[PDB]
Short mmCIF file of C-alpha atoms and ligand atoms in Angstrom, two decimals:
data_model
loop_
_atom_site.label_atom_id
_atom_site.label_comp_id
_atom_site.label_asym_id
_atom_site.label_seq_id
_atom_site.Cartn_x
_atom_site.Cartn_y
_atom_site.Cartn_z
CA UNK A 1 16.19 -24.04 11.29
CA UNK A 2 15.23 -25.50 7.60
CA UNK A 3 18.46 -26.74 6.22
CA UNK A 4 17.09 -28.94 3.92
CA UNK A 5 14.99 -26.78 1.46
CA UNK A 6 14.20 -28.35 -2.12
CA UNK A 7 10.55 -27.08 -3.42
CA UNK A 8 11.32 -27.83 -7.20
CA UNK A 9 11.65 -31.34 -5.80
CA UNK A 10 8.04 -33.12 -6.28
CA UNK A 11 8.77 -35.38 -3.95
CA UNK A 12 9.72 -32.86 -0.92
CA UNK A 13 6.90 -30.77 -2.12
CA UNK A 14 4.67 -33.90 -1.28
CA UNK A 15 5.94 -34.59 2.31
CA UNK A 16 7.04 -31.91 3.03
CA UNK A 17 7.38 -28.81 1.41
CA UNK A 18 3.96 -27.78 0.42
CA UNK A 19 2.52 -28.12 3.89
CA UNK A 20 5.40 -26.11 5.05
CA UNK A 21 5.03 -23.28 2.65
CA UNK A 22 1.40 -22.95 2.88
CA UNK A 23 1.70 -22.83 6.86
CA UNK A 24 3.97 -19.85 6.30
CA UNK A 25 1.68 -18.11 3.69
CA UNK A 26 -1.08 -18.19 5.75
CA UNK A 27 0.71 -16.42 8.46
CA UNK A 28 2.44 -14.38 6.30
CA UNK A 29 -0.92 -12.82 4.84
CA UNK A 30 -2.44 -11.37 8.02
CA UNK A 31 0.49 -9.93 8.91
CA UNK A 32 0.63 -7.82 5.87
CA UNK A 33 -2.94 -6.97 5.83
CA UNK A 34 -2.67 -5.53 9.14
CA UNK A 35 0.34 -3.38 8.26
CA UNK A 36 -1.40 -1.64 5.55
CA UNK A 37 -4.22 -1.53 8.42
CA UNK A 38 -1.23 0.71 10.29
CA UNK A 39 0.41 2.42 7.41
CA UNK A 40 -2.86 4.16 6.39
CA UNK A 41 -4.58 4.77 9.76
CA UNK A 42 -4.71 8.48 9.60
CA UNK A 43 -6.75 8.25 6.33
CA UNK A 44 -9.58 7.50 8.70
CA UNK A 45 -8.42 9.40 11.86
CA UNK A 46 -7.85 12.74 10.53
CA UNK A 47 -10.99 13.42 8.89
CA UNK A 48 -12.34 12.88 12.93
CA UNK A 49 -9.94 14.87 14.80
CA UNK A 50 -11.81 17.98 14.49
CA UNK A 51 -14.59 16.26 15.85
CA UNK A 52 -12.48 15.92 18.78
CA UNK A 53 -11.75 19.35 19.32
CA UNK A 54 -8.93 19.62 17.18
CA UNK A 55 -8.16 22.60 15.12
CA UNK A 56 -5.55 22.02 12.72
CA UNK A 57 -5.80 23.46 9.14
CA UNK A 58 -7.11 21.23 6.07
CA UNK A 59 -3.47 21.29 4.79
CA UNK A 60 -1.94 20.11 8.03
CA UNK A 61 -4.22 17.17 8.03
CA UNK A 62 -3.45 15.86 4.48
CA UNK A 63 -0.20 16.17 5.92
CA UNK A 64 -0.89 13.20 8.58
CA UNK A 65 -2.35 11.72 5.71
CA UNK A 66 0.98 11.72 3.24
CA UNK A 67 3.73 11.80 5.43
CA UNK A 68 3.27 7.61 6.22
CA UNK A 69 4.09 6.91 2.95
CA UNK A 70 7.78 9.27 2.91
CA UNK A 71 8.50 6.63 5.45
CA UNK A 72 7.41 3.84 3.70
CA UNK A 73 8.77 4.06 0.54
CA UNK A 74 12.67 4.71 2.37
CA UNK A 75 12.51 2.03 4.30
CA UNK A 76 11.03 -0.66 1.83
CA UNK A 77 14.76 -1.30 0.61
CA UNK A 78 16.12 -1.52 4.05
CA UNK A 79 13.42 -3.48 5.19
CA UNK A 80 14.03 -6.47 2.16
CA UNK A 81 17.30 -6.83 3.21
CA UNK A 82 16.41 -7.28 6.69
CA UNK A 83 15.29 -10.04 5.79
CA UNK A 84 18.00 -12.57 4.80
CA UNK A 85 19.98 -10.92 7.94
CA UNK A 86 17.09 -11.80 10.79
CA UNK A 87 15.06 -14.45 9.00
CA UNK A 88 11.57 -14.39 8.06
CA UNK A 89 10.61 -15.83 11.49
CA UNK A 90 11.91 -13.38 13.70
CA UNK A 91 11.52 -10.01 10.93
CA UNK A 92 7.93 -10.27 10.36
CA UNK A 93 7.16 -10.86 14.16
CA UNK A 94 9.14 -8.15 14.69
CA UNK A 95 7.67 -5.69 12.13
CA UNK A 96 4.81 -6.85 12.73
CA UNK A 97 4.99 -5.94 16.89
CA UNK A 98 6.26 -2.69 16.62
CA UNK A 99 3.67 -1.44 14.88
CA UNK A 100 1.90 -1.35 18.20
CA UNK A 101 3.45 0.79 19.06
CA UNK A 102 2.24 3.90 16.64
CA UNK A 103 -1.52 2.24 17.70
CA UNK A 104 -1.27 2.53 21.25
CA UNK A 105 0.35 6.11 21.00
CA UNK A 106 -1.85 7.47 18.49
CA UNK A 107 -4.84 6.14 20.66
CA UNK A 108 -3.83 8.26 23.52
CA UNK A 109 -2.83 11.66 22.00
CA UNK A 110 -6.05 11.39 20.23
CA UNK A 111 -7.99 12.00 23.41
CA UNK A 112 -5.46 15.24 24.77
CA UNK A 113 -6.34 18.41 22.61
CA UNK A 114 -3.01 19.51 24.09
CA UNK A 115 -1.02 17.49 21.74
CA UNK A 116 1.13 19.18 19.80
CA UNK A 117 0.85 18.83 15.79
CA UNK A 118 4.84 17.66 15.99
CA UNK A 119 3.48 14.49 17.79
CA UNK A 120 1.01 13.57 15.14
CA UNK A 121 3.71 14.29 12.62
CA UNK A 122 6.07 11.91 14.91
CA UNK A 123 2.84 9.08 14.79
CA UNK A 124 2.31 9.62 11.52
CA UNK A 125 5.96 9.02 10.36
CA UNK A 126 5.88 5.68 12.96
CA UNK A 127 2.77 4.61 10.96
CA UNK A 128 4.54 4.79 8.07
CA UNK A 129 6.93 1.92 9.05
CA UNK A 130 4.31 -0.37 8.57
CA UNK A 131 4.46 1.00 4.43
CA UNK A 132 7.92 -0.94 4.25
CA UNK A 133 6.44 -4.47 5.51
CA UNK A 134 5.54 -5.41 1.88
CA UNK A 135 9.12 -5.04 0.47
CA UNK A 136 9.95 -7.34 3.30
CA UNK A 137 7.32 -9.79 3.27
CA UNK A 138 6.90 -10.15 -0.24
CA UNK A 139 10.98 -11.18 -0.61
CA UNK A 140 10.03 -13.48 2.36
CA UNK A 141 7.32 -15.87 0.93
CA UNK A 142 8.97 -16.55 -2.74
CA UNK A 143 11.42 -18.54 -1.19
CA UNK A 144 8.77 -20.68 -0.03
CA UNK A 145 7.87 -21.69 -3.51
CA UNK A 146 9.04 -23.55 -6.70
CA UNK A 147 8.92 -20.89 -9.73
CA UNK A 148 5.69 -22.50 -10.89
CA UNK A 149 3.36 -21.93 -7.72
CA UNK A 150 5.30 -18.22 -6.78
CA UNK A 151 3.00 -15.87 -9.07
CA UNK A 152 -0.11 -17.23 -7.41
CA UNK A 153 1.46 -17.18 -3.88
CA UNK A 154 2.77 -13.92 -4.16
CA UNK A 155 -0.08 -12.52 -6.00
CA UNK A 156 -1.92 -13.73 -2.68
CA UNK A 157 0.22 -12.10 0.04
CA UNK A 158 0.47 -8.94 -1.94
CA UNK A 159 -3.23 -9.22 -3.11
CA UNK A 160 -5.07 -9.91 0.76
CA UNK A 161 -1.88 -7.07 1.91
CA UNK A 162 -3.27 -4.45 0.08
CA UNK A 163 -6.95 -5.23 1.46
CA UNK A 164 -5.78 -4.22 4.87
CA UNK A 165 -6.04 -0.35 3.79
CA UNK A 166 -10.72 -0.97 2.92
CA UNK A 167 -10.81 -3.38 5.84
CA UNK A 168 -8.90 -0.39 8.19
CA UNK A 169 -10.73 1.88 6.39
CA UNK A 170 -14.28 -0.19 6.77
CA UNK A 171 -14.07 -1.39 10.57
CA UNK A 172 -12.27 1.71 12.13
CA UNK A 173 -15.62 4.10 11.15
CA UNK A 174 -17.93 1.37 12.70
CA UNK A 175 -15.47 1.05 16.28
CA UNK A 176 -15.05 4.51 17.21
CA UNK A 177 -18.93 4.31 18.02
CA UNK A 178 -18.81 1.86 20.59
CA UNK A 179 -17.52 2.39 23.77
CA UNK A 180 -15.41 -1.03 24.23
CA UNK A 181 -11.98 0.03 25.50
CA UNK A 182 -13.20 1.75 28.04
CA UNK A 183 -11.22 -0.41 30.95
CA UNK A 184 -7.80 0.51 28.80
CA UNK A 185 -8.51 4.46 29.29
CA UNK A 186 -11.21 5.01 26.15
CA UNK A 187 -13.36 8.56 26.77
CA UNK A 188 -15.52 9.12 24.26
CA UNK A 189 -16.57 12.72 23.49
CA UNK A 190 -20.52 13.66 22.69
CA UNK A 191 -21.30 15.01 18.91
CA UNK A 192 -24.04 17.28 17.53
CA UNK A 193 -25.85 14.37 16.99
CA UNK A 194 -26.12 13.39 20.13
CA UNK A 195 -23.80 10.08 19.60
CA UNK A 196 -20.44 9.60 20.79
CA UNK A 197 -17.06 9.09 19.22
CA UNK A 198 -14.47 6.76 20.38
CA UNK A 199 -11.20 7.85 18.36
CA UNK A 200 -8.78 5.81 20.31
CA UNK A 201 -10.69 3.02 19.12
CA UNK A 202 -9.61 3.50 15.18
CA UNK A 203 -6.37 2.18 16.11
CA UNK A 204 -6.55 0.60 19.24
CA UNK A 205 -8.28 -1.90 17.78
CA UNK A 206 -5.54 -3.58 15.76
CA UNK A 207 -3.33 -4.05 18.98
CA UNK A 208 -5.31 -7.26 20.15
CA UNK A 209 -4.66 -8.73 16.06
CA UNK A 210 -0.93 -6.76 16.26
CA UNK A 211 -0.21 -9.05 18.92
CA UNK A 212 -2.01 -12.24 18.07
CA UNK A 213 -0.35 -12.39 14.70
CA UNK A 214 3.64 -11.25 16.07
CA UNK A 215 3.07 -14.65 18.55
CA UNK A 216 1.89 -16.40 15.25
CA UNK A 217 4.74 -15.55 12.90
CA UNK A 218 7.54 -16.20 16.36
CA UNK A 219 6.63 -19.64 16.58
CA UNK A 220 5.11 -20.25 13.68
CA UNK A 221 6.80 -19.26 10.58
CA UNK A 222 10.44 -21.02 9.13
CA UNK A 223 13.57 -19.44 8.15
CA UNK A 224 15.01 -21.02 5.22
CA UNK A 225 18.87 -21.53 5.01
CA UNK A 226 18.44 -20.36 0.81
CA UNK A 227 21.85 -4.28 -6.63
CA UNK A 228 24.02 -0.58 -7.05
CA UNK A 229 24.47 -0.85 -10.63
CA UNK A 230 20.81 -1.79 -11.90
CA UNK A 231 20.19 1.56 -10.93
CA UNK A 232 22.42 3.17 -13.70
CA UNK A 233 19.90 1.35 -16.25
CA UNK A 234 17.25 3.92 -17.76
CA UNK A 235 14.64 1.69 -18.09
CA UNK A 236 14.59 1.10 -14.52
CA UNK A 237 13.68 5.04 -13.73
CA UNK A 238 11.03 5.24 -16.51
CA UNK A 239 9.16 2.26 -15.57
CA UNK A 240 9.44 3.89 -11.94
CA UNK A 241 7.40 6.48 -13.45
CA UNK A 242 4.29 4.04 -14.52
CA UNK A 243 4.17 2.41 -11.12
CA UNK A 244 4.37 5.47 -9.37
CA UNK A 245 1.50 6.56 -10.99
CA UNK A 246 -0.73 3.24 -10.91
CA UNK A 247 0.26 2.28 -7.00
CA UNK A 248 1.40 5.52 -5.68
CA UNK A 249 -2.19 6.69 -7.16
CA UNK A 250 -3.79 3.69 -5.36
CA UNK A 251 -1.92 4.57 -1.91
CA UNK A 252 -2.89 8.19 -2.64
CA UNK A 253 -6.05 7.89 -2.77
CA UNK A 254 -6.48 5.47 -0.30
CA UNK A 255 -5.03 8.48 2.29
CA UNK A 256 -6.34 11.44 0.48
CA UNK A 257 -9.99 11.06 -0.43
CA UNK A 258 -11.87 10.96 2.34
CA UNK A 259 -10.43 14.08 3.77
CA UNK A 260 -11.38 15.67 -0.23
CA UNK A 261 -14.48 14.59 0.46
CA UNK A 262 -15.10 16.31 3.99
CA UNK A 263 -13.73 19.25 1.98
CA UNK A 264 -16.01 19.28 -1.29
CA UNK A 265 -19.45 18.24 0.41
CA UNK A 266 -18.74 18.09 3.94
CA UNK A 267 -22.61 17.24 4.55
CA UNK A 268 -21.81 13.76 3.98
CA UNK A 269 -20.72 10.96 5.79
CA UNK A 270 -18.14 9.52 3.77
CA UNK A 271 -16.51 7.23 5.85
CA UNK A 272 -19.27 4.75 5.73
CA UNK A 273 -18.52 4.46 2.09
CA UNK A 274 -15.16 5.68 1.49
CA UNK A 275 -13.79 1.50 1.80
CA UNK A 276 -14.78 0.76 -1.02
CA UNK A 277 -12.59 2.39 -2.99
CA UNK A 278 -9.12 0.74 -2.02
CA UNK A 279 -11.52 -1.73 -1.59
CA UNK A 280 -11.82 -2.52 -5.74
CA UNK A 281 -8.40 -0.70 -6.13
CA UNK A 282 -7.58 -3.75 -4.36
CA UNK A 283 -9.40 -6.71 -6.53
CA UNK A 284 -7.73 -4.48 -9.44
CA UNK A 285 -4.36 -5.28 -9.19
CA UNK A 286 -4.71 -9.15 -9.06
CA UNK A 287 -7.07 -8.71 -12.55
CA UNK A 288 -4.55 -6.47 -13.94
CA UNK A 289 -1.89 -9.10 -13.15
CA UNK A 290 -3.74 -11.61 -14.51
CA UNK A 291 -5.16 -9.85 -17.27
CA UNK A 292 -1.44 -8.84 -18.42
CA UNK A 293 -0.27 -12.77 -18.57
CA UNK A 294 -2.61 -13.48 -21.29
CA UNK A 295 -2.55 -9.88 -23.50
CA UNK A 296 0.70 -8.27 -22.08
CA UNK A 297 1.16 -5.91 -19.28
CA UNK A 298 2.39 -2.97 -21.77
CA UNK A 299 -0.99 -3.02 -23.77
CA UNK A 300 -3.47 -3.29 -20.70
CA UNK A 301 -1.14 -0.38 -18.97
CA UNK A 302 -1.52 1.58 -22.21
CA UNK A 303 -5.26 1.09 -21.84
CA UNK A 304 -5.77 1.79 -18.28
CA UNK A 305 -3.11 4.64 -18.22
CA UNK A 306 -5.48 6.02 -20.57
CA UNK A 307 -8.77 5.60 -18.70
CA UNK A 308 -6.87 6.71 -15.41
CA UNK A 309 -6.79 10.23 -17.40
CA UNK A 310 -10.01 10.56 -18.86
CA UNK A 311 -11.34 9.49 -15.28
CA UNK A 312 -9.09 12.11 -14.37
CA UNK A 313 -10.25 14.66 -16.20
CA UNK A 314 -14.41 13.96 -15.58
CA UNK A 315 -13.71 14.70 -11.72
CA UNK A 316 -13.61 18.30 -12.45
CA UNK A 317 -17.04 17.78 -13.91
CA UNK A 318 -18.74 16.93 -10.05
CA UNK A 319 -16.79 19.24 -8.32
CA UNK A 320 -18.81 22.30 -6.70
CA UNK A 321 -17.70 25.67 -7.26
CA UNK A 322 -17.78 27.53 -4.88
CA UNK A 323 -20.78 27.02 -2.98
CA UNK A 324 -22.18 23.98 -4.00
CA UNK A 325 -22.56 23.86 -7.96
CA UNK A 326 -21.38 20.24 -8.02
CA UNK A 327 -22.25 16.75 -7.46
CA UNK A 328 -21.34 13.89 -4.65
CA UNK A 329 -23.08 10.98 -6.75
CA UNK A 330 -20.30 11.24 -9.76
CA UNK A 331 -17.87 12.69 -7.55
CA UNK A 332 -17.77 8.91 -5.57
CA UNK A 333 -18.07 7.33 -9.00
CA UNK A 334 -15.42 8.54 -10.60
CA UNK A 335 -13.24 8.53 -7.35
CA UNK A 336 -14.23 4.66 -7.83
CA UNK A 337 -13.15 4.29 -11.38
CA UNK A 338 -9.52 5.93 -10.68
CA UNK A 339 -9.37 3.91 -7.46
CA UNK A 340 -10.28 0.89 -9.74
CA UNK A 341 -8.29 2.13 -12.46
CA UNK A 342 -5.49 3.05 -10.44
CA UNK A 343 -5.44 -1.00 -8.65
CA UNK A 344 -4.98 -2.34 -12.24
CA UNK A 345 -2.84 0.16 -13.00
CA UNK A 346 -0.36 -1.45 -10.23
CA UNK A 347 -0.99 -5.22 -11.51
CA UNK A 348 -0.15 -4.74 -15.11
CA UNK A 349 2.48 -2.13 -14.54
CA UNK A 350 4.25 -4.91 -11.96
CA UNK A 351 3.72 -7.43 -14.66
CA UNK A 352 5.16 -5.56 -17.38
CA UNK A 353 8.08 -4.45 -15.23
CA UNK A 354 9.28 -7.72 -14.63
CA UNK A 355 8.74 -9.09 -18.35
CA UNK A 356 10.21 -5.27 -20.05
CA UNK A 357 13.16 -6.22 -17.22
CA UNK A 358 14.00 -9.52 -18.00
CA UNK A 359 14.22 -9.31 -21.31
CA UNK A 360 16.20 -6.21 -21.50
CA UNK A 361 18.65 -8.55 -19.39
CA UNK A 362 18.34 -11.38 -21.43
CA UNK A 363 19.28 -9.98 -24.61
CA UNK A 364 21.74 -7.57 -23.59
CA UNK A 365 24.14 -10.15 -21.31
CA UNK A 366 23.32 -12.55 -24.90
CA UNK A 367 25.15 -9.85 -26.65
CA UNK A 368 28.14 -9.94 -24.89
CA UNK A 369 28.50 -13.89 -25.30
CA UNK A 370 27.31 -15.53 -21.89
CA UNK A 371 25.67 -19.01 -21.26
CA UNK A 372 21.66 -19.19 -21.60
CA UNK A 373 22.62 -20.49 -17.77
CA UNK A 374 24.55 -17.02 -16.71
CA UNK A 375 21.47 -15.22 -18.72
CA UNK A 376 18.93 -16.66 -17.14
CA UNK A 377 20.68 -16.10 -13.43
CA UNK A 378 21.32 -12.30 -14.34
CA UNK A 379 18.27 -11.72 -15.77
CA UNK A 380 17.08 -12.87 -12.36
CA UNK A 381 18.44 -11.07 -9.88
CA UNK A 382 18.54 -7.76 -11.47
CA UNK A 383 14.46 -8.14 -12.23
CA UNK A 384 14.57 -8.93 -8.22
CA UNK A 385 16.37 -5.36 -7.42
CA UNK A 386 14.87 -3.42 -10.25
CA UNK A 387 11.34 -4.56 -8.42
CA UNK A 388 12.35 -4.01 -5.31
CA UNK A 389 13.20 -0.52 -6.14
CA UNK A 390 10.72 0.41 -8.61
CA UNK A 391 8.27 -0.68 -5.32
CA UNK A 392 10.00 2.07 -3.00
CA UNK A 393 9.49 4.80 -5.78
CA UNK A 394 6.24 3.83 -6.30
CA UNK A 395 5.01 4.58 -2.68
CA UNK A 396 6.38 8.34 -2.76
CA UNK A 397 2.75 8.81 -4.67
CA UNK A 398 1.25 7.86 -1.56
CA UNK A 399 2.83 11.02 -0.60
CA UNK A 400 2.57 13.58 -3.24
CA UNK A 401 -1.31 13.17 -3.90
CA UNK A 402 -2.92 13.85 -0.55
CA UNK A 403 0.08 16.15 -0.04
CA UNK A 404 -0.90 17.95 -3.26
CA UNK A 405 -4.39 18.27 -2.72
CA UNK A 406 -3.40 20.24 0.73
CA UNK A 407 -0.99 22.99 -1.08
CA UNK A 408 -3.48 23.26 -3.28
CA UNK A 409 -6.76 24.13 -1.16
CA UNK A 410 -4.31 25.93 1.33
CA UNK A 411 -2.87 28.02 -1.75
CA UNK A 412 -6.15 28.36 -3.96
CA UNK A 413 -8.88 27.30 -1.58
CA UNK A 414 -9.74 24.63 -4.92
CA UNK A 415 -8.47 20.92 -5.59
CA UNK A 416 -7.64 21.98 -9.22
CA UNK A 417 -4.51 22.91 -8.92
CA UNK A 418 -3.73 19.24 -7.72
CA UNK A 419 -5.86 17.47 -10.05
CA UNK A 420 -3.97 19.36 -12.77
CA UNK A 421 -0.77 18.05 -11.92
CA UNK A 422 -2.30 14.62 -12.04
CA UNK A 423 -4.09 14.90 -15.56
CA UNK A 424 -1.08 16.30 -16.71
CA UNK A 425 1.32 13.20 -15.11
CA UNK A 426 -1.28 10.71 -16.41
CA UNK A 427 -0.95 11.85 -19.89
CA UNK A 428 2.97 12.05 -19.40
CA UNK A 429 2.28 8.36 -18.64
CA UNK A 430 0.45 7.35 -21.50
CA UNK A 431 2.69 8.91 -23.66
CA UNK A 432 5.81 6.89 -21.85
CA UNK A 433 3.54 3.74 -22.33
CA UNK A 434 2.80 4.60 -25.64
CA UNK A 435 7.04 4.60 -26.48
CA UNK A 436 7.99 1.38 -24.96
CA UNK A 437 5.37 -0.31 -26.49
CA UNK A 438 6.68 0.90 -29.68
CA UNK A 439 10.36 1.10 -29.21
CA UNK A 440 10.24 -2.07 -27.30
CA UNK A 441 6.95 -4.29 -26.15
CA UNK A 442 4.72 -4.28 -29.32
CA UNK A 443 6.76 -7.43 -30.44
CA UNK A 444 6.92 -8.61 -27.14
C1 OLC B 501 12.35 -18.90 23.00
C2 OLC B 501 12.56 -17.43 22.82
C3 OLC B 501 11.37 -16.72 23.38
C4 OLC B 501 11.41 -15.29 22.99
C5 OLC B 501 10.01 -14.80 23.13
C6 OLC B 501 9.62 -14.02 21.93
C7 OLC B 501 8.31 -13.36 22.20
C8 OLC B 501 7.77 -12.84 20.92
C9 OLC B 501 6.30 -12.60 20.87
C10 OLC B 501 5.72 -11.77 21.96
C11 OLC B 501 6.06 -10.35 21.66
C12 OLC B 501 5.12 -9.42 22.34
C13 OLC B 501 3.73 -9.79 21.98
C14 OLC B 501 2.82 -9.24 23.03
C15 OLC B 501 2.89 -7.75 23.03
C16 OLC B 501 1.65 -7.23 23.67
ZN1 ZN B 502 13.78 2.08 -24.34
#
């Protein structure tokens, strides 16, 4: 439909352009915030489906909890490609509508104690689509802007995206209380406290905004008429590493802790609280972007790699053993400071990618003779691949964490054995932080 596409032009921008882009943006936005609504769902839900009469095993519910993020992170490649082929228009509607899918559904089987585990596993797995909307709607909206104004706007869509996981995580505990719904087949069930809980509600409740935003992005968002061998680079797979570590950690989490929680002190109510987490994790990433443009995304990664393991290490400190020796007050705390830590972990990580990337480009196509034009177009596209790809990795951390923590209680009974393996990664990471910054960043 847009044929005639020129942002760099100031003129077009004026008229034209600007209005256009920001129109898209702002439709753009929601639509990714509710995905990671989608994608994380079960974070909430199965901490509350023994309260339904459930009985599956602590290790089988981390399970619900991980296995979004498997699907995720494979189809966040497909999914940017998808793109160009459909449109922006048509794709996000469309990945944005099926997700209602996985809402509806999981609604139901909530409310049958007769359904099977292998359909929560099937749900969970659907949720997970919504994982792979970033990839898509983040290669979307750059197109929209001149190279100047397309760090802020994607630092926006990517930035409000990731909220969607604390405002999921904040509205879907206050919902399942009230008995709206109950005209669409709602039944609430009757707790020890004499309230009542209303899981369908957790995600039924993003069906009326599912729907409201695939209309908005059909008619209206714009199309505009404007990879193998970067994997055989090394660099690529390290720096896979760091991100995997800062946003798989913040993904992770995000699915993982509350159902710790209910494990460690399962007195306490954690899902009035537990938003605030990916809620800061969140905030993070856009000050670890920003802080990396002015002091460089290796040194601040450095930093925060190193704080992610020393946070890492103090959890052990507030954990009870066995019957209640430990502490909920620091255990929250410290979750916060590796949720934090783990959110500007993903900014300056991103940052440094991209800047490590280029420049690795740069220099190396230089060295082989090549215009500064043929540099600077390589050194483009290959950045633009290596990120995509480095953001698929990243999401299997989504998986391993809450994953981890369930071998490990179902195995030992204790989260130690998990938060081992994590220590242990995180110093892994500082040490791989600690190289390129001397073998390459340091003189930046
Ligand atoms: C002219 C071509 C018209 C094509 C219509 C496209 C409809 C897409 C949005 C509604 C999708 C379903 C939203 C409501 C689901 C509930
Ligand atoms: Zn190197």
């Amino acid at each position: 439909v847009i044929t005639d596409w020129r942002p760099e032009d100031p003129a077009f921008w004026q008229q034209r352009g600007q209005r256009i882009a920001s129109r898209n943006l702002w439709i753009s936005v929601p639509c990714l915030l509710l995905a990671f609504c989608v994608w994380m769902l079960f974070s909430a839900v199965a901490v509350n489906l023994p309260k339904v009469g459930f009985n599956f095993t602590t290790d089988q519910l981390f399970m619900l909890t991980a296995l979004p993020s498997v699907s995720g992170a494979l189809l966040r490649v497909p999914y940017s490609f998808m793109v160009p082929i459909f449109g922006g228009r048509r794709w996000t509607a469309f990945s944005t509508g099926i997700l209602i899918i996985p809402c509806v559904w999981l609604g139901f089987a909530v409310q049958d104690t007769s359904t099977p585990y292998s359909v929560f596993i099937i749900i969970s797995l659907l949720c997970g689509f919504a994982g792979a909307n970033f990839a898509s709607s983040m290669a979307n909206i750059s197109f929209f802007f001149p190279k100047q104004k397309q760090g802020g706007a994607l630092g926006l869509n990517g930035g409000l995206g990731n909220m969607g996981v604390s405002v999921m995580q904040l509205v879907a505990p206050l919902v399942v209380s009230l008995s709206i719904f109950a005209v669409f087949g709602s039944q609430g069930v009757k707790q020890p406290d004499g309230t009542e809980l209303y899981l369908a509600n957790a995600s039924w409740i993003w069906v009326p905004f599912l729907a409201i935003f695939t209309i908005a992005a059909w008619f209206g968002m714009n199309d505009l008429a404007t990879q193998l061998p970067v994997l055989k680079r090394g660099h690529l797979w390290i720096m896979s590493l760091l991100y995997l570590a800062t946003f798989g950690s913040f993904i992770g989490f995000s699915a993982g802790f509350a159902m710790l929680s209910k494990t460690q002190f399962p007195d306490v109510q954690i899902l009035q609280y537990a938003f605030f987490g990916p809620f800061i994790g969140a905030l993070a990433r856009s000050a670890g972007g920003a802080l990396s443009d002015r002091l460089g995304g290796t040194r601040v990664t450095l930093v925060n790699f190193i704080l992610m393991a020393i946070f890492s290490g103090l959890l052990f400190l507030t954990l009870p053993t066995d019957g209640q020796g430990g502490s909920f007050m620091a255990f929250f705390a410290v979750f916060l400071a590796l949720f934090l830590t783990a959110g500007l972990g993903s900014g300056s990580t991103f940052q440094m990618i991209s800047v490590i990337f280029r420049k690795l480009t740069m220099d190396r196509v230089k060295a082989e003779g090549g215009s500064d034009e043929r540099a600077m177009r390589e050194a483009a596209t290959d950045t633009a691949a290596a990120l995509g790809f480095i953001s698929a990795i990243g999401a299997i951390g989504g998986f391993f964490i809450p994953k981890a923590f369930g071998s490990s209680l179902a195995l030992t009974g204790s989260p130690v054995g998990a938060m081992k393996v994590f220590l242990i990664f995180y110093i892994a990471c500082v040490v791989i932080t600690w190289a390129v910054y001397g073998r390459h960043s340091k003189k930046l």
